[PDB]
Copies of this chain bind each other. A is one copy, B any other.
C-alpha cells in the first residue's frame, strides 16, 4: 500500500522467481511484421520463429538494464537515467 519503495521490492522479488515472457504476443508479432515489410514484402513467418526472436530480445535487453543499474550505483544514486544507458552502450564496445 503506502510507504513507496516497499512494494517495489515485493514486486521485483515476485517477478524474479517467475520465468515467463513479458511482451504481449500480438503487438510484438505485428511489429516484427512491420520491420520485415521494411526489408522485403510478403514474408510468411513461422510461429515458432517469432517466439524465438522474442526471447532473445529480453535477454539482451535485461542485460543492458543490469549494467545501467551498477552504473547508477557508481554515481551515488538509486534512480537510473538515460545518460547511463549511453554510458553502458558505449563502454560495452558495441556502439
Chain A residues near B (Cβ < 8 Å): 67, 70-71, 74-76, 83-84, 87-88, 90-93
Contact = CB atoms under 8 A, between A and B. Distances in A.
A89 to B, nearest CB: 11
Given A67-B91, A70-B90, A71-B91, 15 more contacts: A70-B87, A70-B91, A71-B74, A71-B87, A74-B74, A74-B75, A74-B83, A74-B84, A74-B87, A75-B75, A75-B76, A88-B91, A91-B91, A92-B92, A92-B93
B92 A91 contact: yes
Binding site secondary structure of chain A = helix
Contacts of A84: 74
Which 5 residue pairs are nearest across A and B when measured between Cβ atoms?
A: A91-B91, A74-B87, A67-B91, A74-B75, A71-B91
